[model samples]
Target chain A: SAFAVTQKWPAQFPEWIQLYSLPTPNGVKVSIMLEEIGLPYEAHRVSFETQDQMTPEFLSVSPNNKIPAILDPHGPGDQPLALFESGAILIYLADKSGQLLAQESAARYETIQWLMFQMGGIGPMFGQVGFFNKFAGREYEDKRPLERYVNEAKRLLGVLDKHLGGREWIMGERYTIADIATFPWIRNLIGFYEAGELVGIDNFPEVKRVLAKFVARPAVIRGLEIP
Target chain B: SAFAVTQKWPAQFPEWIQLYSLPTPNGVKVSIMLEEIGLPYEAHRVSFETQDQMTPEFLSVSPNNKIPAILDPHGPGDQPLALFESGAILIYLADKSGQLLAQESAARYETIQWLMFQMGGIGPMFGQVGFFNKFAGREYEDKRPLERYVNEAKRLLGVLDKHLGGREWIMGERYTIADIATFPWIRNLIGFYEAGELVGIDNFPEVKRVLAKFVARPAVIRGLEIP
Candidate 1:
C-alpha cells in the first residue's frame, strides 16, 4: 500500500479498505457503516493512550491527528484515496456502496443536512456535556459551563425528538447515513459517556426509541467493538 | 413559492433562490457562495434580537432555528428544495453551480473532509471561545472552562496553519468550498468576536495569511452584510 499509515499499522489485507480508528463515538460511525454495507475492510485501533495518533505515520493520512481515518484502495477511478473526518467517511462509503444514502438529489442533500446537524451541533455539544459531566472539566469550581452545554444538548435533543416523532429514522422509512451518523452519538451521550440524567435523556423519547432500534441491528453490535 | 418559509419571508423573485439568514459566520457561508457563484437570491434577515429564529415560519425551513436557511426555487430536477446547515448548503450550491468544488472524485472528498473539520472542530470550539470570552459566560468566576476552549481553538488553528504552510487555499489553489466554509469563522474569531489575543491568533501566521486573502474577495465583502 502506498499510504504511509501502512508502515505503522501494516494492513494485512492491503486490497481491502483500511480503517484506522477506535471504538469512540466518531470512530464507530465508520465501522457501523462498513458493516452495514458489508464491505471488506481492515480496522486498526489508533490508541490515544499511547499517543499513537500523534505519530508521523498516522499523521500522514490524518493531518488533524484524529481517529476514524480511512484509505480506500478501490476509490473513485479505482485508485487509492486517503480521507479523515467521520462524516466525510460516512458519505464516501455510502456513495461507494450505493446503499444507505438517498439516490434522489433532493433527498440526498436533505440527508447531508442532517448529517451536518450531527457534525456541527449534536456531536460537539454532546461531547462537551461528556467533558463537563464525566471528564476533567467536572472539577471546575463553577458549574455554569457544564450547564450551558447541558441546556444546548437538551435543546438539540428536543429538535431531534420533534423531527423523529412520526418517522422511524432521521429521513423517514429508510435507515440512511444520517441515522448511522447520529444514533451512535446519542447512544454515547446516554450509555458510554454516562451523562443521561445531566441532559435529561428521557425527555426525548423518540431519540431513545430510535437508538434502541439502532443498536438492535447485528451490524451495530459488531461495530461497537472494532479493532 | 410553495415552501412554507416563503409565507413569512416572502420571496419577491419566486424564480430565484430565497435565503433566510443573518450575517453570522454560518449564515455568511451560503450568502458568500451565492455571491461567488452569481446565483440570484433573496436574503431575509432572521433576527436573533427579536427571537425571529424561534418563530414557526423560520422553523419550518430550519427546524434547528439557526440562521442561514435556504429555499432553492430552482433545485434538483428544477423543483423546489429547502435546506439548512451551512456545510450542507455550501456543498449544494457548489454542486448546483459546478464551481468552487473539485470535479474529480478523490479531491472532492478531500475538500469535504476539511469542511467537516471546520464544522466539527473549528466552528464549535471557536464558538465556545466566544461564549466564554465575549458572551455571558465571561462572568463566570472560574476561567478554566474558558481556557479549555482557548487551548482547543489554538490547537485547531495550529493544525490549519500547518496544513496551509505552502498552499494558497485549503485545496491548494483551487479555492474550493473548503475555503468558503472555513475563512468566515476565522474572520469572526478575530474581527467580529474580538478573541484574537485570547486565542493567540498571531501564533498561526498561515491562517491569518489566508484569512486576509479570503475576505478580500469581492463576493465575500458583499456577503458579510447580507440581510
Candidate 2:
C-alpha cells in the first residue's frame, strides 16, 4: 500500500492523513510539506466552482470550510487528529517527519519566525494584492484601492529583496521550512496573480535567486501537483 | 537582575523589551498577548505620524518597520531575540513561558490553527474593511471595493460565528493563545474600524458572546489601553 487507506478521499478506516485542498498558494504549502516529509497522505480537491469547500463533509474536518486540512488517523491514542491551518499542518508534519525543522536550539525557533512571517505578512499582503489586482476588486471604478494594495505589495517585496540581499535563503545557509513556506507564494504572486510588475518582482535579485532555487526542488515540483 | 539586558535599541536601551508600536489591530495583538503572558515588558509608542517606524533603529530590530517588535533578553542561550510580526511574538511567548497552549496534542494544534485563522483570514479581511470603510478608500467614488470587502468580512465573520457556536473558547474549555492572538483584531474590526454595523457584527451572537468574555480578561484590559 504505497498510499494508505486513510490517504484516500472521504477517508474511512484512518491509516494515512487526509488532506482536503486545492492547488492554491496556501493549499500548496501543505502538499509541499507532505512531499518534503516524504509522507504518504491522501489529498482531495474541494472545488470552489461547486463550493465543495462549504460542504458538511469538508466542514467536519475544517469547521471554517477552508481548504488544506488534514486528519491524522493514527492519533496519540488511536483517535484521529483533525487539523486545519496550513501553518499548523506544516509544523505537525515537520514534527512527525523530524525533517524541515531542526531539533531544539538549532534555529528551529528562527524557522518558526520566518514561517510566521509568511503566515502573517507575505500570505495576507500578497492575497490582498491578488484580490485588488486580478480578482473581483478589479471591477471597481476606483483604481486607488487596487493601487494601494499594489504599492504595498511592492513595498513588501522590496523588504524581502533587501532581507534576501546577500543570503541564498531567508535564514541563510540552511534551506528549511521557512523557504518552503514562502517561495510558493512568491511564485503565485508573480505567475498566477500576475503582479510581477506590480510588485516589481524583477528588481529583487536575491529574492529571484532564492526563488529559482526553491522551485527547482523535487519536493516543490511534486507538491505543486498535489491537487 | 530580574530584568536582563535585551538588545540595545541604537543609543537608547529601554527597560525590559522596548515595544515600538501604534494602536493598529496588528500592534494590539502583541500588546494583548504580552498582557496575557504577564511578562515584564516595556512599551514605547512608535508614532506612525512621525514615521518613526522607518528610523534606522526601528529598521534594525524589524526590517519591515512594522509595529509590535520586541527584544527578549532571556532568549535562547541568554541572547536577545529581536522579533516583529505579532503572531511570531505570540508563539514565542507561548513557547518560552509554556503558557496559553494546551498540553493535549490535538488541542495544541487546534490553538495554533485558530491563531493562523486570525493571522491569514480575520486580520487581513477585517483590515480591508477598515480601509474601505474608514480610511482613504472610503472616499472612493465607487462603492464596490468597500462592498466587496464588507461582504468578505461578513463571510469570514460567519465562519467565526459558526466555529464559536458551541465552544466556550475557540479550542474549547481553555482560553489559549488563539484567543489572545484573535480577539483584539476582532474588537478593532467593529469597534475602532467602525465597520461593525456595516458587516452586521451583531448578527453573530456567538462572536458577541465570545468577545464579551475576551474583553473581560485582565490582560485584554491592559492591552487595549493607549494602544
Candidate 3:
C-alpha cells in the first residue's frame, strides 16, 4: 500500500488493517473491537508527544488529524481504504467481521443509535468535564464552565443508568459496538480524567456493573494496552 | 403504533415515520433527509416551550430527552422501531431510502466518517458557540470558554474547507449522508448563532460554497419548516 501514513508508522504487517492511534478511550475502541471480533490487524502508536499527528503523512490519512484511524488493505472491491473516526471504524469493523453489530435492520440501526449517543453526547460532554476539572480550565476563577459540563455528563449517565436497569448491555442481551464504543470513555472519566467523585459515579449502579463486566472481558483487558 | 409518545403528540399519519422534532439544526437533518428521499413522514413539534421535551411521554421514546426522535411504524422484520439522536436517524433513513448514503463498503464507511465528524465536532462545538455568543452564556465575565469553542469550531470548518476544495460534496461529487449531516449545522452556526464574524466564516470559501448549494435544494427549503 502507498498510503503516506505507513511511511511514518511503517506497518510490520502490511497485509492486515494498520491501526494508527494512542491508548486513549477513542483509540482503544478500535483495538477492543478488533480483539473481540478476532480480527487480525497491525497496531501502530501515533505519538502525540512528538506531534506526529500534524505531519502531512498522518494528515493524508485523517484530515481531521485525530487518532484511531485505519488503512485496510482488503477493503471493498479489494481496494485499499484509509478510514478515520472511531465511530466509523467501529461500524466498519463490525460490518466486516459480522460479529458485534446485528445483521437485521432494527437491531442494526438501534445499535448505531447508542453509538451516536456516545459519540455526540457521552464522549464530548465527559471530555469537557475533564477539561474543566483536571486540565488547565480548572484554574479559571468561575466554576460555571466546569459545573455546566459536570451536570451534563451526570445527566447523560443518569439516562444510561435508567436504560441499563434490567438490560445486560446497551441493547439488552447483545454485546454490540455500542458497548465497545462506550465503556472506555466511562472508564477514562474515572481513571485518566480523575473525575469519578466529581461526576458521582456511585449514583449509577447499573452503569458501574456493566463497566465492571466490560473491563473484565479478556479482549478489553488486552485491547487497553498496545503500541 | 402504540408508542407512549403518540398519546401526548398524536400521530396523524400513524402508518408513516412519526418525527418528534423542532426546526433546530439537529432536528432538520431528519426532515431534510425525509424530504430529499421522498419518504412519507408525519412531523410533530416537540416544543421546548412548557418543558415539553422533559415530559414522560417524550422520554419514553427518547430517553435522551432531546428533539429529533422517530418512531417508524414499519421497521426491520416489520416491527416498530423508536430511534433517537439525529445522527442515528439520518443513517437509518439513508439505508432505508438507499439514496443519500453509499451502498459500497468504502464509500459507505467514508460517508459515515464525515457524519461522525459532524456529530462529535461540528454540531457540539458550534452549539457551544451559540450558547456563548447568541444565548445566555454571553454575559459571562470571562470569555475564555466562548473563545475556546469558537476556535475549535473554526478549526473544524478549516478541515471541511480543505476537504471540499475540489469536491462537490464531503465525498466528491456524490452527495452522501455526510453532506446532509453537516451543512445544516454550518448554516445554523452562521445564521442562528450569529458567529459568522467570530469564526471567520468568509475564510472557509469552500464550506460557504457547498453550504449555499446545499440550502438551495428544494427539499431543504421545504424541510426547514415543519410542525
Candidate 4:
C-alpha cells in the first residue's frame, strides 16, 4: 500500500481496507459501520497516549489529525481512497457496502440528515458535557460553563426524545447509518461522561430505549471494543 | 402545503423549496447552495428576536429548534421532504441539482469529509467563540472556556489553511458544497463573532485568501443576507 498511514500501521493484510482508529465516540462510528456491513478490514489503533494522531503518517491520511480514518484498498474506479471524519466515513462505507444506507432517495437523505444532527449537534454538544462534567474542565471554579453545556445537551436530548417518540430508529424501523452515527455518542454521554443526571437522561425514555436496543446488537457489542 | 412549518410562515410559492431560516452561519449554507445551484426556494424568516424558532411550526420542521430547515415540495418519490441540518441540506441540494458534489466516488466522499469537519468542528467551535466573545458568555468572570474555544477555532483554521495551501478550493479546482458548507462559518467567526484577532486570522493566509474568494461570489453575497 502506498498510503502514508500504511508506513506507520504497516498493514499485514494489505488487500483489506486499513482502519486507523481508537475506540472514541467518533472512532466507533466507523468500527460499528464496518461490523454491521460485515466489511473485511484491518483495524489499527491510533493511540492518543503516544500522540499517534499527530504523526506525519496519520496526518497524511487525516489532515485534521483525528482518529478513525480509513484507506480502502478497493476504492471507487479501482483506485485507493483514504478518508476521515466519522460521519463521512460512515456515509462512504454505507454507500460502498450498499447496505445500512437506503437505495431510495428519501430514506437516504433523511438518514444523512439525522447523521448530521449527530455530527453537528449530538457529538460536539455531548463531548462538551463530557469535558465539563468528567474531564479536566470539571475542575474549573466557574460552574457556568458546565451549566451552559448541560442545558444545551439536555436540549439536544429533548429533541431526540421527541423525534423518537414512536419511531424505532432515527429513520424508523430500518436501521441505517443514522443509528450507527448517533447511538455511540449517546452511550458515551451516559456511560463515560457520566452525565446522565446532569443532562437528565431519565427524561428521555425513548433515547434510553433505543440506546439499550442499539448496544444489544451483536455488531455494536463488538464494535465498541475495536482498535 | 400541509407541513406544520407552513402554518406560521406560509409558503407563497408552494412549488418551490420552502426555507424556514435566519441568516446564521448554518442557515446560509443552505441558502448559498440554493443560490449556487439556482434552486428556486422561498425563504421565510424565522426570527430569533421574536423567538420564532421556538414555535411549534418551526419545531415540527426542525425539531432541533434551529434555523435553516427546508421543506422541499418536489422531492424524491414525488413526496415532500422536510429536512434540517445544513450539511445534509447541502448534500441533498447538490444531489437534487446534480451539481457541486461530484459524481466520481473518491471526490464525492472527500468533499463530504471536509463538510463534516465544518459541521462537527468549525461551526460548533466558532459558535462557542461567538458566545464567549460577543454573546451572553462574554460576561463570565472566568475566561478559560472562551480561551478553550478560541484555541479550537485557531486549530481548525490552521487545518484549513494547510489544506488550502496549494488548492483552488476545498476539493481543489472544483467549487463544491464543501466550500459552500465551510466559508460562511469562517466569515461569521471574523465578522459576527468579532474574533478575528483573537484567533489570529492573519496566521492563516490561505484561509483568508479562500474566504475572500468565497464571499466575492455573487451567489454568496445574496445568500448572506437571506431570510
Worst 10 residues of 3 chain A by lDDT: A1-10
Give TM-scores for every candidate, taking all chains together and pairing residue i with residue i: 0.98, 0.92, 0.99, 0.99
User: Which tens-of-lDDT digit does each residue in A139-215 have in candidate 4?
Assistant: 99999999999999989889889989999998889988999989999999988999988788999999999999999
Show pairs that collide, candidate 1.
none
> Model 1, range A20-108, lDDT digits (tens) per residue?
99999999999999999999999998999999999999999998999999998889999899999999999889878999998668999
Superposed on the true interface residues, model 3 gives a C-alpha RMSD in angstroms of 0.9
Distance from true location, Cα of B90 in model 3, Å: 0.9
Candidate 2 C-alpha lDDT tens digits along A1-227: 23332233555534787878899998999999888888888777778999877666677778777878888877556667888889988887887788988776527777777888788778988888898878876676767877887887777778888988888788788788888889989999999999998778878888889999998989899999888
Q: For model 1, what is the alpha-carbon lDDT of residue B187?
A: 93
Location of the lowest summed lDDT over 10 successive residues in candidate 3 chain B? B1-10
Isolated chain B TM-score per model = 0.98, 0.91, 0.98, 0.98
User: Model 2, B78: alpha-carbon shift in Å?
Assistant: 0.9
Candidate 4 structure quality by residue, lDDT tens digits, B101-123: 99867999999999999999999
On the 0 to 100 scale, the lDDT of residue B19 in model 4 is 92
Cα error, candidate 4, residue B34 (Å): 1.0
Give every candidate's TM-score on chain A. 0.98, 0.92, 0.98, 0.98
Question: Which pairs of residues clash in candidate 3, taking residues 3 or more apart in a chain or in different chains?
Answer: none
- Over the stretch B188-208, how does candidate 3's per-residue lDDT look in tens digits? 998989999999999999999
Candidate lDDT (C-alpha), each: 0.92, 0.79, 0.92, 0.92
